[model samples]
Target chain A: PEAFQESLKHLLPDLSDYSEITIHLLHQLVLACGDVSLVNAVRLSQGAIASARDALKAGCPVVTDVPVVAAALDQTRLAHLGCTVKTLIDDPHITTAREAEQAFWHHDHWQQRLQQIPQGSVLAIGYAPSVLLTACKLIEQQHIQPALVIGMPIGFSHAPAAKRRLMTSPIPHITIQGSLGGGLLAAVALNALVETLI
Target chain B: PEAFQESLKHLLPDLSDYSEITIHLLHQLVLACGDVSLVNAVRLSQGAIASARDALKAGCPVVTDVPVVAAALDQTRLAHLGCTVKTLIDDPHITTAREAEQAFWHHDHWQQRLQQIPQGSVLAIGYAPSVLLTACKLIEQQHIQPALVIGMPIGFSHAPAAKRRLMTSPIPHITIQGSLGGGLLAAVALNALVETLI
Candidate 1:
């Protein structure tokens, strides 16, 4: 991993203005897409890291919008901290009833399932703008109070709008502005937090 | 999928100058990261799409640097065309010997495996700079002649350097310049071709 460390060494100088945890997280995000400019768009709510760390320590479940986001997470490290990662679209009922893209918006079951996600869990949404939008609505309604919402879904329109809503919401969150996010980047954000905490 | 189509309609105006296939490919890449500016960094060699279409239509195997790229690909579509997508690092021997990060560089088995990748197969490397670098070296040495090389690995230093090497090499390729690529984008590049060819 010397090469990766070297890459990090090269990346660290541009991120010097940020705190240690933010730098670590931003570096991971930059490394994920190889874009230093991504740091400029990243928005971190106050106490986002601390809340995520606290939730991880308390063994809260981590919920992702899609299985790809769940697949990219550090399951071993999260499991060591007693945190379990679950994918929302992995339900058999959803898969049988509709396509992945349609299930996110059209399925009442998906909306209900999102509502039923465990309280105090960390919501890591890396795809499906609808999931993030619904999470924002639920948060607004006091239906779910996640420890930290990592809302980094990727789309031309809805994703950006959903992220904007998340930014203004009361929930502690980590997201990127405009249309610059993905499941991998979202997973990397949470992984950075895990790396920082452990 | 009306929303996605609408998003594409909005995206198409900026990509008006490119060829039909290129526009399709670039739009997918743009959607992958929600960055309209990504089209500026894309580098598609002459006949890159045609070569990819030929290989895929002939049922040539598609090789990937990692399983994540393989996971992101349209396997059902590729399978319909008689193309099977394979991940290089999924070899049990490699997995058992070294960690995922270390295997790409420190393992002789991985090097040997890369060399043995089927001739005329499409190589879609979305992660691991060393794999892309080695492939570029192999191409330069006339050791392998892949149909199309989607050389997009995400790293600050080596990945960009590897991509530069690929840009100069003789292989038909589709890549992005600087440090602006990843497994998802790389897979989307190939998926775009699959959609066009089908």
Candidate 2:
């Protein structure tokens, strides 16, 4: 008598295109949202599921772009994995972006955090397209090799284009297609993965 | 390498059953959040999209609760609309929430910013549940009447409740249900609406 499956059945039972295990992943994601509609909205890369399973199985450290996202994650699971959530949004070492006009706060924060991202960690980005773009560029440059890149930064100008860039990358990743994403959604994706495996 | 449309083609080319022009709106919303899967995660009221369109058609002034959203908007379009973006985030007059004793910064900020929202203005909120809660209560109190409300505050407790209140109210609103929201997401919702109508 799981109320989750009961309600999901009442609202939408088919779980379009999502596998049996994948439906549970989306279920947990929707639970975090309290919105049943997301079960249908989630986009899963072929490797997204396996990568999350493998990373959580290995207890890889999860790094996020912002503090809010870092705070929203499941501490119990991460603690069980002997890992903790980390974010560079408030890194004391960050001064300014090397590329921007030196006054762009958002760009500066994204730029400074680049060198700070841990290598081969799970990178979950929920805000700031610049962070996703920067992370993708770093991956291309071979500066880092994250286990999984959960990239969902929300913006208008560069945001849509950046996710498109991520979809084509060789790196293993989990992201929503088109322009649908945020910190909670990104964090929920990780949570769902963690809950699914453990 | 034409990866944008290519992957969208392979992933979700025309998932319009969700709603007409909604995928575009969702696409832009996800663009702000950097996730395409959010086409399903988002919840729009019957009047939410139409309200934004009508308000933009009328060239309503955009008032935001935070400086981040004010800074994130498309100034050129706003300028073209003969409107200016406004925020009450830095009101020095604010010391605490109107109801609280003192010492609570988050509660206090919302209290101070409420009266600052101009009547008939389009109110955009990306963070702070207190702001949304205050706005709703104040509206019921007959203090202010916004043209449209973008209520996407992020919090573990108050944010979700505040959005539900907005949804039930007569006020026109765009919100991410539950705890999935932020200034960036809120601002881009307006940007997407503005772009769609313009």
Candidate 3:
């Protein structure tokens, strides 16, 4: 039961649009389940992914919209690689544009968040890759090398994460940028990984 | 000494752009100096803010451009109310932003890194207020209110933050959209406060 609980705690890293309290309840459900097979996790996560996407498409409730960074990443070829990525969409906790200025990204904490990923895990994205960029630069310092990485932040949130993502993806980093972004835009960052990993 | 050091800490949050080592040093500095009031904390904070901003503007060596969201409260008009109003430009924090996305506000962990202010502290905006829209919404739940807010976001990051900021400001929220939204067309939604407050 404790092991199952630990598995649910791991869900904390996953980004869900659900309310924090609701996320806690759903998290408990995951803990009650046992050592889930990779297939099972994928199967469950995929259902969530599809429903969330559809909800956005239908304009059902008040979920996020399309052409969104993560949505674009999922619709892209990366979705074909048995790749399962959790995205932290940029929705600042505050509402006013004024206060947000003081709260945007800084150093130290940047690497702290990325280092939470398990060593064997793949870090994927659609534009905002500052995390990867910083992580790469600091990897040798922290001794972490994400196995398969994807750097893409479809909107303004793109560059930093991509820069951090690429610094350490010597194996196969499939990164994409805005189409105008000459340097390997989101076009086939995934193809590079799929072809290489295969 | 301990009393003096503790009193000084109250002026700003622990997250006040301080390194752990700096924290102890500053605390010690306060202790050596008898009263926090005896030392000019405002001057100290002001100078520190200026130095960091200048370092960033000059493009300090080895700096990572972190897109920042700034807040500026407008005490200009309110100062006549005997408000003892405060207003100034502040960009303290050694951060770097790439040439293209420099004004794009790309910092990843920006919001969570804000200095802790007392409740009901005014969160203002300079020429740019859009970036803090989402941040404001989140802060409202925390019961923080911006006394005099500025909805200014001067550059490319403006469009959405402006709209969202306008719809979310509990107090005044000015938008500079000023007919430049292009013919691209957008369906708009107004939140509760936007209608009543604005």
lDDT of 2 at A196: 57
User: Judged by TM-score, which candidate is best?
Assistant: 1
**Model 3 CA lDDT for position A61:** 18
**Per-residue accuracy of model 1 over B24-117 as CA lDDT, tens digit each:** 5655676577765554567777657668888998999999888778888999999999998778877333221124456665545877767887
> How accurate locally, in lDDT, is each candidate?
0.72, 0.62, 0.31
Q: Report the candidate with higher lDDT, 1 versus 2.
A: 1
DockQ of 2: 0.01
TM-score for chain B in model 3: 0.33
Query: In candidate 3, what are the lDDT values of residues A1-198, reduced to their tens digit?
Result: 012123323332334322222222222222322212211121112122223333233322111111233343334334444344443335434222222223334323534546565554555543333444555665556566554444433324323444334533443343322322212223232322233222
- Per-residue lDDT, model 3, residue B98, is 23
Report the poorest 10 consecutive residues by lDDT, candidate 2 chain A: A94-103
Off by over 4 Å in 3: A1-67, A75-83, A89-110, A152-171, A175-188, A191-198, B1-198
DockQ of each: 0.02, 0.01, 0.01
**What's the residue-level lDDT of B198 in candidate 1?**
76
Cα-based lDDT at residue B51, candidate 1:
80
